[PDB]
Curated annotation (Swiss-Prot), chains A, B, C, D:
Disulfide bonds join C3-C82. GO terms for biological process: antibacterial humoral response. This is Avidin. The gene is AVD. Homotetramer.
Length: 124, 124, 124, 124
């Protein structure tokens, strides 16, 4: 059996996400819920759109998703791999790119930040 | 007066992509065409899915998308901004993360590459 | 009350490093010890050279350094900040770029990997 | 004959650098001169410390260097490869990490930006 994207996840920074069902083509949607980035009020929710690589029907697939922020002009992309570890726990190890909006093409060079995130299943 | 993602673009390496109509939620799909990476043959086509940010309806929006490679177990994600350049040309400036599949979670650390890509309109 | 780089540290993967005294221009040298990457054997040691930023004499300075791999044609660069964590422990948080050698300039696009590393004091 | 680091270089953004002689060990120093980043007055100069990988005495070596900014609390690291192309011109293709200084360990996630730079010899 394989590492499944569908469901509820949580990270190290305290953000959560829900991913709906993965279609035949390898497609999925969900929502990204966060508490840190720049501002919000309290808790904010944004949609995510992604894909799971289905080649060789691997048990521990790679994937990618885009987060369309609703409270900002930015976009964030995540890519990683759905692993199985801890004693048999599912884990997502990801790396991301955060693109800020700049006003002029000449500041383009300073628009992209990078980092990681690790996700584990939310007690449920 | 409005950098649009819909269309045919080509890059700095020979790869091309075509993007469909963007819908009201800022969602789009498209196709990615290349021969790079490591696949000889002639040309391979893979699907892509992403979003364009609509907050504040900027004329030079940020966006993101994932390429679901059909001839590989990898995933590539792209993020950037659609700019109107000094000469009136539309230019996509992006950065990408290319995720390779590993067999052991232990090898995760070396699974991520990063680079840039510059796209220009081809549908002249 | 002052995160210092001088010392012995270990990371999240088993690698260790020792850094010498930092001089008045913020310059330092040291050694990097590991068995990862892809080199079996037991343990290999490579030299490192870098700087610590002294502008404003912050207590949690940023720094950078390069590892000159002695058993490979590659180069790795690290950058981060030396923090004093909530519990009083010193912590190095860094990101790295690992550059592999290519034969043709044409293959440049795929030569760069990126990741993270967390260091903790070992010289207890 | 090989691609040599020693000398004067210029980039795409309009910054310049001078690299002194490379010792036996593969070590070098130089200065980084820039006009864009955040502020300065007019033209600012900062020192750089790096290394050239000498394994297999390659003709087109990889290298890494750290830039110790003098007008800011940040640090930038560059890594890349010294190529030969254009009709036989020397070029440096680089990728970099820019670390900003943050006040608290909890904002660490947003401290690192990434990008590229291409350098060519300054008419001399």
């Amino acid at each position: 059996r394989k590492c499944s994207l569908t469901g509820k996840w949580t990270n190290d920074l305290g953000s959560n996400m829900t991913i709906g069902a993965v279609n035949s083509r390898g497609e999925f949607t969900g929502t990204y819920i966060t508490a840190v980035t720049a501002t919000s009020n309290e808790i904010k929710e944004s949609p995510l759109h992604g894909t799971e690589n289905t080649i060789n029907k691997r048990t521990q697939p790679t994937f990618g998703f885009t987060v369309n922020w609703k409270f900002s002009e930015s976009t964030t992309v995540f890519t990683g791999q759905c692993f199985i570890d801890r004693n048999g726990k599912e884990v997502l190890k990801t790396m991301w790119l955060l693109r800020s909006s700049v006003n002029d093409i000449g500041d383009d060079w300073k628009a992209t930040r990078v980092g990681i995130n690790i996700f584990t299943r939310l007690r449920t």
